[PDB]
Ligand SMILES: CCOC(=O)C1=C2N=C(S[C@H](C(C)=O)C(=O)OCC)c3ccccc3N2NN1
Ligand SMILES: CCOC(=O)C1=C2N=C(S[C@H](C(C)=O)C(=O)OCC)c3ccccc3N2NN1
Ligand SMILES: [Ca+2]
């Protein structure tokens with residue numbers, strides 16, 4: 602398995618670790634998204650310490666407006682992060 | 692660096708390895724895309740052995756219709772692959 606293939610597997614793996622905690626087990630609710638960002642994105646994103654930031658991030662990622670982050674919305678979140686890191690250093 | 696962070700870095704790293712080979716060094720031309728798929732996606736995608744498959748894949752990924760795969764189009768390609776693997780096993 603190449604580095605890219607590992608990256609594909611990691612994306613699926615992390616999303617499921619967090620989404621299967623509570624409620625709908627194929628979607629990230631706000632508390633699951635927060636912990637995902639806090640535990641797994643600590644070198645890229647500011648630790649989230651406030652409800653209003655949790656709320657705004659979910660507002661941003663939630664394209665279909667159902668209150669949670671599904672797998673496709675997670676993939677779009679990853680693309681945002683990846684494009685930002687890319688553009689920082691390019 | 693967590694597994695997700697590694698995956699973010701790998702995405703940027705692989706795209707640049709391949710895109711900087713020839714011509715526009717921030718885009719994948721057909722030959723660079725083919726080698727990327729052949730070398731780095733061999734467990735997920737069929738080896739590409741034919742010009743018409745190279746052509747069709749590029750046709751598919753090339754949303755802005757400029758003939759090449761830019762970083763955003765690459766990110767969409769990764770999402771396709773990730774969603775397909777996700778749905779296979781779910
Ligand atoms: C946000 C408060 O804490 C920090 O900024 C720290 C931080 N931040 C980053 S980058 C990350 C980004 C790009 O938003 C970030 O959280 O900073 C906010 C501007 C980082 C990267 C590698 C190694 C250690 C790091 N680190 N240690 N404390
Ligand atoms: C395409 C011709 O060669 C193959 O199919 C091989 C193949 N294929 C896969 S999966 C991959 C997918 C899902 O499209 C694929 O190329 O198969 C086409 C149906 C694979 C995964 C793990 C380990 C070894 C593997 N492997 N060894 N020969
Ligand atoms: Ca959930």
Ligand SMILES: [Ca+2]
Nearest residue numbers: 663665667669
């Ligand atoms: Ca949603």
Ligand SMILES: [Ca+2]
Nearest residue numbers: 710713715718
């Ligand atoms: Ca190129």
Ligand SMILES: [Ca+2]
Nearest residue numbers: 753755757759
């Ligand atoms: Ca294009």
